[model samples]
Target: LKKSGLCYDPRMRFHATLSEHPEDPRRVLRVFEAIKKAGYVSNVPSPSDVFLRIPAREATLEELLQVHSQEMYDKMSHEDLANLEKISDSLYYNNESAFCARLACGSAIETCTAVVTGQVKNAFAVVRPPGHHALFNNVSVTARSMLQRFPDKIKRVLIVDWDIHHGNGTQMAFYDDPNVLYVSLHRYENGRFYPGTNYGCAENCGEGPGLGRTVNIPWSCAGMGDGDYIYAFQRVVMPVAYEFDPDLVIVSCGFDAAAGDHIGQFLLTPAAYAHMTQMLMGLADGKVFISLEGGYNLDSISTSALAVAQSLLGIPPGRLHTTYACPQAVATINHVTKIQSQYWRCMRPKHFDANPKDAHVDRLHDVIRTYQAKKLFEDWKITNMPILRDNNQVLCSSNFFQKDNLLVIVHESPRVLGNGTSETNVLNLNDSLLVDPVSLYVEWAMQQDWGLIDINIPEVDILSEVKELCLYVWDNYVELSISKNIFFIGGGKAVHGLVNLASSRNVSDRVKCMVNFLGTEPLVGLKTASEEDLPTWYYRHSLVFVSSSNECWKKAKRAKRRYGRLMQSEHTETSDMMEQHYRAVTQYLLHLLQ
Candidate 1:
């Protein structure tokens, strides 16, 4: 059996940064040591051995110029170390940064070269100062080197980047190139994520000749785990990759998404990394070259990296039962597929066996309902606010100064209307039309002397947009209104949006309280808010109505430190809990009003 190749050198550790910085040289060193400790690397030539070491060398200026511009090259090579650090936002530099960066680039190139030359089945380059974020005027060093160095041997290249942060530079490198296929799975909390840009969005397929070559699967929120990644691979990654049929596959491997990584806050296990790596081995004649990118946690990075290296050495990935995707992941996948289907034929929506086969029927119904909602708001003199998108979703009462308190109902719906059925005959309309009770309450509240704003969230899965919409409502409507007190009523995942809005706004003085109808899952986003030092504000005023068996409520004493008052109900159903807790919640608000 052909041995997998490993690339490492003691010199790569010379590239150092500030002590507190997560992207230190030890990031790569730990992975290297872990792989070595696994008994994969050996000095003596052995066909029986699992791995072979490849010498790390500095990339020549000629090779570097292939991907990066001369201006960028001179800036890194000739400019002062401190000056480079000052110029770049997330970059750090030492006197040896230039040298170590070149070596890292060279290590990436040579590792791929070894695989394409049939010397090894596959390879992993444990190099640092991660190159996916490196932007030269041209393609990245590993990609351009493979395509340019061995044109006859290597034609089409697939660059798979699974970094927690978006690989903005690398994605842009082949943004308009037809020969290279760039697929990135990154944390894109809308455009709010780091290396924050819409460039990482799923709609950003390639341009010009490379129209369909680029594919981005940007996550909506954090807490993505093995299920999410595996689902993405099966749904988005593998289908496109098989169609592309690249001659070489280069992975911009990043392990920050691994569990225990504070920087990533994702929950991917080491076996998930191996599974992903093993899946990619089916492409490019198994010619896979993994170049390390961003990963902070030492234990996570090392174990995850080792798992990937083990896969390269022809070990089968461990069993993973994570076949189902999360709701957020499913939403992202559907969104990506909708846009990407226009380009890739493989992703075209297949025939569905579900009820209501004719989508136009549902489409017509949506238009009619939207029109009715608009007219109803208009008749009530409730005006729409000027927001970016979802212009018709928000309706604010005209009598803003009439009351001392504002009830901001953040829920999903334009309100449910009886469709040719009598209200008396409608069995559990509150459950069937989940938003009906909220809408009914809002109608009743409109008669009362209080300022009211109802935000009908169109899509709950696109959480980045949801967060922004909540913030906009708070900033423009709630803050500007004459109401002295603000109360937020959030339902389901919309609760997360309200939490995000309050955490970011950081002004709880005028805000009365936040109430959410939570289910089984823990509050990941709310916990994130607490981590950011907004816990005292959140814990003091927030009230969560959880199901009796809700996981978060089960650990009340510990969870209440992050969440506020936790109320459990015998009712497990959402509508039931909302109904049961409705009077009590209003009583608390009424007490505050006094």
Candidate 2:
């Protein structure tokens, strides 16, 4: 990264004014000076020079209009430089403020250009006065628009912002676009904080067609530190990111949350900044772009930028480990996860509309019995059994424990819902019927002369339980020996559970056919042998149904190519209520059974 296209307005120094503003020139200068001192320039006198040369230049009026409205863009024009404060409350100028601001915009544009054009795998544009909050100026100049400017070169963009304040402008720009995933973590003290608005809440996700694209982690209050931010990146941001699978990743890389920034009032460190960058580097196949947004503390901003630069240059961010995030942080995280998961299938929640209470040794004797009575119909005998992956339970429907044409259907249910919820397995199974999605399918199976197996677990253990159930079925397959062939139908938690089972030793041949619905997600590798493809034997034996809008279906070609087949479908929130998916599935299985 010797020519890392590191761009920023070091020329912001010209806007040095009388008052000490948080968005001052030296904030950029401090970060810039720190990097130069650490040998981040071209003339480093040796090839071993760990440097990134950022060429800085002015941005033309045309580039500014690409995302900003004329009202905001006019402030940067020559005529407005004479009267700057009246332009926007958060902005002020002393002639060069206008020049330096546009110059910072240029830094972001050029920095993005290097990575987009393949000149650099990634570049960090350290700009002044921050762009995240300038979303009020309605900014969209990061990775999101880079694809728009050169749509041929980039297919998707994932923009991550960790500024202490939300990027209302940035969020608004691409709020409804499918090609971009914009995620941010900012401080929100209930609308009383600066620029505090409902826009930052988890519920306000993106509008219209972009329902799940925008993710927000709005902290209830501040004093947030390393644990809080790191926890967020791991639990919330990174999960959706891997699932979104963008072509390029851009970071609204702001340090206002660093240890001593009064405006941010948070306690993240320079080391944390480095760590954040390192985690994001895991995505977009390591194609990352960094730009400055907001940071006030002189030492923290400069030092933090150095840490990020070091991370970019292959320096390791020191190892960090934490056992806990503040309850408030965890609460905020769970809230955001629920909001985002509704649209993105990557969010795997253990509970629904969940509020964490003490997790204890819970049991399911009654739920199993009720489920068995309904699943077993027309003289079919019933068996209730306890299984040992945990102190878990299961229900099987059998006529003398040997029903011909047996169908095993597994479904998902939350472990907990607020104070009032659930009849079988738990949570809002259904308001009137007291049965969740799993039981709804179970009842449908019984009507079609099929015996069913009902399984439930916390949504988080979806993959884990899938493997667990596979072993259980393997152990029992000998007793159900009379059944020449078996069928499996599943969605959500049960999808991977069965696929993983089908891949294990000698398991591929025993099943007749399996159907897995991702709702709106990718059906991943079965058996852990390979994620891109199921083993050839299992591929021919399985059927995967995923979202028409996802890229995984193309990767799922391995399923199609290997003679395995997949169909396209979209999941509705009321898929359980409508039961149309179940009816369609029933018809497909009936066709298969014949």
Candidate 3:
């Protein structure tokens, strides 16, 4: 295996005889238990649909020699195989620990091989005593041993270490290799944490060919949440990864960086973990795996695991609570820019500019603008108002009309009046009797010696004419204006026309009331079942059923049948013919209402 090529099989298992350590056995059992609870056992496909699986294998001496010195490997093996009682406090001496390390390396190799061959997409090796701290040529092997073997098969390998602490081992393993990229975002130490060497300075790129491949983004104690994580990812990680475009993307998945953890001082949430997963998933075309490293707080570990799982399953996780009050540090921002600049120089030397700050700020601003604009312009409209009662607040009242107000009805099409005349009759009134022989009703009301106000109704242009008439009455008539009184009544089409006319006009407070009876304007709450089912006329506007009832169609068909039966001369007598038709239609409506 060179800088990028590695291989492994899937028959590995660890055997432990000791059943005594309370935490170790329980923690291992809990991992499997959680897996089972998530329905993984019953639902596991024959070949396993999960992206990666662990395998069993021991490293050959030559392969081990690539990452460790022969003497150190021999010493560690000799002690473990001989059942020696003496072992360093930092190293595990049991057969179980050796088996665990072998399985971890095997799992990483298997996953890496699968990714290189396109047999599997990506994988996670849930290993312990994590990989980052172990150094190459060191006897105590760690997971870094697996990552060190992939150089020839892949041109570029991007190692993203998101553990709470610096991945000193992994970083050192590839420090002199240009083809291997090691990037770490970890918490800075004030001489308290282990292996506290370089604190992610801007100048620590690499030596010679690997001059710009080693990038570290160290977060201060106060700056660590959604905002901080997003800032680092966007400014540092994403730019470099996009420029590199490696064949395989590997994550050192550690949840100890999560907020409220014993080892971390930042307030990172599960949502942040999910977000990071999604971003890397996009970068790697889903060829990404999460290997467990740190995170002792079981609750945060479990929650973070669920977050990554949900992200892999394409489920959206909820928001994170990251309300740290400290302002973003300038040092972090400059460090990000510096590393990004170096990567860009290697990837796109010609197009790499000195300043990307303005562009980034502009993009963020545009996102906020779009979100706010969409929220502001979301649709809302008022359509209906209930009829109110009370003398001063009455929308419509019987006393305002008096006995003298003349009621009118209108037809949308041509029609005739009564009394043997050919006058057009368009008046439509609520009372059936008023529409029946309308001329006779008008004459009768005229003979009653009351002050008569003629309700002029017209066909086709009824809406426009009514509005003009109301404006005229308001502008000219002094008694009508002083009394602040006017009342109009109609039914069906005539009522519809009147209501539309009244609504369109800018009448003053003097105009008392306008009543529409059994009128249909347009139906509300109408929606199209599908895009193709939408009416052509309703493409850019709302369309509604204007007639409201199918009964109107039936009535019109019946009226046409009745009109067809009259003799030619009788039909030519328009006034008499219309009166008869009106009478019949009025009676029909009355019977239906009853």
Candidate 4:
């Protein structure tokens, strides 16, 4: 392929150099060895020509504060500096990896500086702890915010993050600014993995004046082949970059996206990298610098690096033989374009109506809704108890009666009367009678500035519905509570439901106690009892049976046996079939409390 002269222009010579950092003795050595084998030492240019060398320097607190919060900087400063053991534990640091990052960023800057100032035709920075992942305020070495200060020297910067994972940190840095055009093509695990966010969705266009400056092409899965890369460059990156017309191009070159890397499963070959490099170099007038970001496999890295070198040398592109095909690539491109169509038009309003689907506007509506729902459901919850108020004064009345040492029987159900007349009389006498008793006790507690809460239960079939209602109340009307304190009281089936709700809310501590009136089950196939029973069985082995009349006992037992079997079977099936649903509901309830 090199003999074909596609990448082997006689005038274009490659400069291979390694970054020097005393802190990373072994890494510097490895990079030196790699560069030596790549033949940079033997082919040294004139001594007077600027040989870019990355210098070692710690960024100042003020400089770092330009991008990161002060708290993060203070934490890093407190750690040991010599062995750099503290660098590993710093939230900003990863894998005892700080010095390596500095070397990488410094190397990229050196290379870019050389090319921009005409000291070199082209350069590659073989540095580690890649910078694209480093955010503005992150104390880590690959601080992208540092580049913001060099806008004059590096105007119209186009960052191409080709790492396997999304460059969330880098994207965050220039999300609202237009001077920097950031384009990333990465694997989208659909928000399942680390830093799982904004996987190249088109709607993530730069906000404010920077709109349409940010471009993302998120691959649906790994093993994406040459087609995926080519499609993205053609449909997403190329169009944006051509329009933006950057003066300098920086490639966040990570080979982990290549096939066989343990951490990544993308099927990118060396040839694909070469093709991509060739395409970028063509657009940028061969004035481009590639910075190492996140390639771990030694074989893949070395081969992919050679491919890049060959591409820069104008070698003929090689063929791809992989069997995997990412048909989703087209869909992904279309999806991203749809999202950013509006922003694309806003940036170039004259061309907006000319092409509709290729822009990012169509997907904006869905993106807004997604973010809105996420924001709304962030902190919703459900609790076992209700904030009770006195009927007369709308203030807690338990204080007056509790001082009299009255027995407090807090009825769990919201309704004092039962479903049937006979059952109602029985419930009123046994359970409802306790409401006054409990109020008396609560009145005394209130007098002493202490409080009591009554657990309110709806009917059986409506247990799930009630739980949802409680969650809504907690999420939307939490401030309307009587004393602004959640409390729990219990009786019969109501006790069961309240306990389950409390567990769901993760506020079991608020439940003062359970008041039980044992008898027989009233309604057969009752939904509330079944749900309450499941949770009750998990937490504690207890049950409550309520019967209005002695005749109700026989029928209640028969109903319990019949409905109990069906509920048990249904629960088992549903749990197996809709585990995600179960989890979502549980999480939704818990969110309300938080």
The prediction achieving the highest TM-score against the true structure is 1
Across 1-594, the per-residue lDDT of candidate 3 in tens digits comes to 111111222222332453432223333334434544664322243334232234435444445444444323421464424122222212344435554455555455555556555555555444443233312322113233434444454556677888778777677666766766878887764424545666355457777777778887766554377767766777668878888787567778777778778767667788988888878877655566556666767777767766766665566866757533245444575645644554464322222233437655443233333432333234211011122224110111122234333323322222222232112122233321212333343343344322223233333465556555444433443234323333343333444444344344543333333323332322112132323422222221211122224234344433222111211222322233345444444343234224
Clashes in model 1: which pairs? 68-136, 69-137
The per-model lDDT (C-alpha) reads 0.74, 0.66, 0.47, 0.49
Better of 2 and 3 by TM-score: 2
TM-score of each: 0.58, 0.54, 0.47, 0.46
lDDT of 1: 0.74
Pick the winner on lDDT between candidates 1 and 4: 1
Worst 10 residues of 1 by lDDT: 83-92
- Residues 46-141 of candidate 4 have per-residue lDDT tens digits of 333222333333334344444344323322554422222333233245443454444344444455556666555556665444233323322122
Task: State the weakest 10-residue window (summed lDDT) of model 4.
Answer: 2-11
Arranged by TM-score with the best first, the candidates are: 1, 2, 3, 4
Q: Cα deviation in Å at residue 321, candidate 1?
A: 6.8
Per-residue lDDT of 1-594 in model 1, one digit per residue for the tens? 788888777553344443333346677678877876877775464555577878887676545543444323321454422233233322224543555656666677787789999999998887665333424412266787677667898889998989888788887778887888999998998878888889999889989988999999999999999989999999889999999999999888888899999978999998899999999999999988888877778899998998998898878888664666899999999888877877787885632333556754444245544664676576677776567753457777777646787888887543344432332222344554423556555665676657878777665248777788899888876777777788888877677788787667865678888888665435543545356457767777888776757665455455444566666667765555566777787778778778
Query: lDDT winner among the candidates?
Result: 1
